Paper text:
The structure of [name] [name] (OsD14) was determined by X-ray crystallography to a resolution of 1.35 Å from a construct lacking the first 51 residues. Inserted between strands five and six of the central sheet are four helices connected to the core by a β-hairpin loop on its N-terminal side and a shorter loop on the other side. This domain, commonly named the helical cap, forms a V-shaped lid over a deep cavity, which is assumed to bind the SL hormone. At the bottom of the cavity is a canonical catalytic triad consisting of Ser147, His297, and Asp268. After model building of the protein, residual density was observed in the ligand-binding cavity. We identified this as originating from MPD, which was used as a precipitating agent during crystallization. MPD was added as a racemic mixture of (4S)-2-methyl-2,4-pentanediol and (4R)-2-methyl-2,4-pentanediol, and it appears that both stereoisomers were able to bind in the cavity. Judging from the electron density, there was a preference for binding the 4S stereoisomer in one subunit (arbitrarily named molecule B in the PDB co-ordinate file). MPD is located some distance away from the catalytic triad, forms several hydrophobic interactions with residues lining the cavity (Phe78, Phe176, Phe186, Val194, Val244, and Phe245), and hydrogen-bonds to the hydroxyl oxygen of Tyr209 and to Oγ of Ser147 and Nε2 of His297 via a water molecule. In the second subunit (named molecule A), the binding of the 4R stereoisomer appears to be preferred, and the direct interaction with the Tyr209 hydroxyl group is replaced by a solvent-mediated contact. The helical cap covers MPD like a dome, but is open to solvent on one side in this conformational state of the receptor.
Strigolactones (SLs) are phytohormones that control many aspects of plant growth. Despite their relatively recent discovery as plant hormones, rapid progress has been made in understanding SL function, including the identification of a signalling pathway for SLs. This pathway involves the SL receptors of the [name] ([name]) class of α/β-hydrolase enzymes, the MORE AXILLARY GROWTH2 (MAX2) F-box proteins, and the SUPPRESSOR OF MAX2 1 (SMAX1) and SMAX1-LIKE (SMXL) family of chaperonin-like proteins. The [name] α/β-hydrolase enzyme uses a Ser–His–Asp catalytic triad to perceive and hydrolyse SLs simultaneously. OsD14 has a α/β-hydrolase fold with a seven-stranded β-sheet core domain flanked by seven α-helices, of which two are shorter 310-helices.
Author numbering: 52 to 318
The structure:
């Protein structure tokens, strides 16, 4: 907690304004993934950036495998950062696992989260009886095996699929941070995400929410955005980016920045 947590998770506060925005990165990146959208926000907003404890840019000996076996422990870190910074109200932009973290955080502390922007967002990745999440159990078992048997080969193959569009600089950048993650931590985060099911709690979210949908995301079927819009408890809209990929902040930052400026205008 406190100043030590601000140090350990590389917390940075840039820009200025009464509109505070937290940018929270996803699996396989760190806060540098926001570097190209950041200049579109800092004239108008006070921006809080931090690294998840699993990021390769954080000393991996801080990663407590027992503590971080659920997403609520990541929520605890986020809340402790905002409390240490004395921030009473903010908008939160979360990618991937951070979209799940933001949902949970907005339920824990509805006073603190005035708006959510969710990128690469899903409440559940595994398929269920009448629910298409995009993944089967046997498929993820093989992914987990590949991550353990040869993490470098797995990451080399995953990076272009996650970026989706043929944007070589974005593949190189995502690869860099993926290869920066300790393989056991990377596997553990993925296992934690795949066992999370937020469907039942979506109606507890009170904050307005913008769900950013790209034209294809290897981890998020197109139908998930409509599910989130139907079930999130706040005023929710889906904003459609005119390109593909799981990491639009890396592959199409100027387009994503348009959505962010609109979504962060008033809250």
């Amino acid at each position: 907690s406190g100043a030590k947590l601000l140090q350990i998770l590389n917390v940075r506060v840039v820009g200025s304004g009464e509109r505070v925005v937290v940018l929270s990165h996803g699996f396989g990146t760190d806060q540098s993934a926001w570097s190209r959208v950041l200049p579109y926000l800092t004239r108008d907003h006070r921006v809080v950036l931090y690294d998840l404890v699993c990021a390769g840019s954080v000393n991996p000996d801080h990663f407590d495998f027992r503590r971080y076996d659920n997403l609520d422990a990541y929520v605890d870190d986020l809340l402790a950062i905002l409390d240490a910074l004395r921030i009473p109200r903010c908008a939160f932009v979360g990618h991937s696992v951070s979209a799940m973290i933001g949902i949970l955080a907005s339920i824990r502390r509805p006073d603190l989260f005035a708006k959510l922007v969710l990128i690469g967002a899903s409440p559940r990745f595994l398929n269920d009886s009448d629910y298409h999440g995009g993944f089967e159990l046997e498929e993820i078992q093989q992914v987990f095996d590949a991550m353990g048997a040869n993490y470098s080969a797995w990451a080399t193959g995953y990076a272009p699929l996650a970026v989706g569009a043929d944007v070589p600089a974005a593949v190189q950048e995502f690869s860099r941070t993926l290869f920066n993650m300790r393989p056991d931590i990377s596997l553990h985060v993925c296992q934690t995400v795949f066992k999370t099911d937020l469907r039942g709690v979506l109606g507890m979210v009170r904050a307005p929410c913008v769900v950013v949908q790209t034209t294809r995301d290897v981890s998020v079927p197109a139908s998930v955005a409509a599910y989130l819009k139907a079930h999130l408890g706040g005023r929710t809209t889906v904003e459609f980016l005119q390109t593909e990929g799981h990491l639009p902040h890396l592959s199409a930052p100027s387009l994503l920045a348009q959505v962010l400026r609109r979504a962060l205008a008033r809250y």
